[PDB]
Design a protein around this ligand. Structure first.
Ligand SMILES: Nc1nc2c(ncn2[C@@H]2O[C@H](COP(=O)(O)OP(=O)(O)O)[C@@H](O)[C@H]2O)c(=O)[nH]1
Ligand SMILES: [Mg+2]
Length: 404
């Protein structure tokens, strides 16, 4: 049980291929499908400590109610791990086979999806092979941890140029900020005396970096408009044993103390009850079901050799936004029906179980027509149809079962 399930692959021919089956298997499973989702992503350069940090996100996700979740100092780091099989820089994006169910403060039993997004952001594998995944995971995440080395550099901000172009359009269309949280995680920070480790120091740091000369890095002037939350955490260097090694055999004892001290505040600061942010688009809390719709949409857009036109992107999330309002209606109805005549439920009367259908179907039609939909009036007629012929095919399956 549990492990990385490479979902979105980027093959040698600029082709983004999405393995739907594995994806449905995880997100569609009957335990989670209906719970609202928190989609946490860590993006950024390969070989910068991502896997490492993620294995520690797991140590916490599992052993969440126990102070010593960091593990046994005099034993070798031994959790599930994300670095399981990396024979190469397979530059796509994997997610954690197991979802996690947790209770936020106010009560909602929400679900938590972790996604490691590999890329390079370096050589020629960038044009359509880096800000492509990064683009991807951002769109669908609710929390993006942008894992950087030593400093937020001009070239790091450059990769956001895309998101601010798209976000500006989504904002015009929707009147809401496009994205949720963006967390700048700076690793091996080594000017404690200039800005303290952790979030407070990070906040002052990130304020200085983002102010305002410089080229077309007026990503500066628009980021903020795009995310409801940008924030920053300054992590220490892990000591030389960790940094000097391909695979890190040693024990927790061998990691630097001031790194452990801050990692211990870092992980709960990101995950954990109050910190979690439910995925939200055009005002609509996405669910685990709903979120498969977005994956599906954002993946037939990143096909070809050209990153998409911000205009096509917007249209991708409109299709998804629409396909999701449909998916809930074909479930609001479905659940209400399973009450009037499901399981060992009684009754009958065709002439009667018809009006309770036209009833609930009309109720469910409003539910849809009302959901703030994006795309526009005509664009979503296509989906009003899709809806009705699914509630109707669901009806049939109830007439059949009703007969007794
Ligand atoms: N300097 C430094 N090295 C790290 C840190 N975390 C992990 N490493 C090491 O640097 C390499 C990065 O490995 P990994 O976590 O797989 O990075 P990823 O492939 O980008 O996810 C590993 O050999 C680690 O032992 C860090 O915070 N700072
Ligand atoms: Mg990795």
């Amino acid at each position: 049980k549990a492990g990385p399930v490479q979902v979105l692959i980027v093959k040698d021919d600029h082709s983004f291929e999405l393995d739907e089956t594995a994806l449905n298997r995880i997100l569609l499973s009957e335990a989670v499908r209906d719970k609202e989702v928190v989609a946490v992503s860590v993006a950024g350069a390969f070989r910068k400590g991502k896997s490492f940090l993620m294995d520690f996100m797991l140590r916490y996700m599992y052993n969440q109610e126990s102070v010593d979740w960091v593990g046994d100092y005099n034993e070798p780091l031994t959790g599930f791990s994300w670095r399981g099989g990396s024979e190469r820089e397979t530059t796509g994006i994997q997610i954690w086979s197991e979802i996690f169910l947790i209770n936020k403060p106010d009560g909602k039993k929400v679900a938590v999806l972790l996604m490691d997004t590999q890329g390079t952001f370096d050589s020629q594998s960038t044009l359509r092979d880096s800000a492509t995944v990064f683009a991807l995971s951002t769109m669908i995440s609710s929390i993006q941890v942008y894992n950087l080395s030593q400093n937020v550099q001009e070239d790091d901000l450059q990769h956001l140029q895309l998101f601010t172009e798209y976000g500006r359009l989504a904002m015009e269309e929707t009147f809401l900020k496009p994205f949720q949280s963006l967390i700048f995680l700076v690793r091996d920070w080594s000017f404690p005396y200039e800005f303290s480790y952790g979030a407070d120091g990070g906040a002052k740091f990130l304020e200085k970096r983002l102010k305002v000369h410089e080229e077309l890095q007026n990503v500066r002037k628009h980021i903020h408009s795009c995310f409801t939350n940008i924030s920053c955490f300054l992590l220490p260097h892990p000591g030389l044993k960790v940094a000097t090694n391909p695979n890190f055999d040693g024990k927790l004892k061998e990691i630097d103390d001031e790194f452990i001290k801050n990692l211990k505040i870092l992980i709960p600061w990101l995950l954990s009850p109050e910190s979690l942010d439910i995925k939200e688009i055009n005002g609509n809390k996405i669910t685990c079901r709903g979120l498969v719709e977005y994956f599906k949409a954002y993946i037939k857009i990143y096909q070809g050799e050209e990153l998409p036109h911000p205009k096509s992107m917007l249209q991708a999330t409109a299709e998804a936004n629409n396909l999701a309002a449909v998916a809930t209606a074909k479930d609001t109805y479905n659940k209400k029906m399973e009450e009037i005549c499901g399981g060992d439920k009684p009754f009958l009367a065709p002439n009667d179980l018809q009006t309770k259908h036209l009833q609930l179907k009309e109720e469910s039609v409003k539910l849809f027509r009302g959901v703030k939909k994006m795309g526009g009036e005509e664009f979503s007629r296509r989906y009003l149809q899709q809806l009705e012929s699914e509630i109707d095919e669901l009806y049939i399956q109830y007439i059949k079962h009703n007969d007794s």
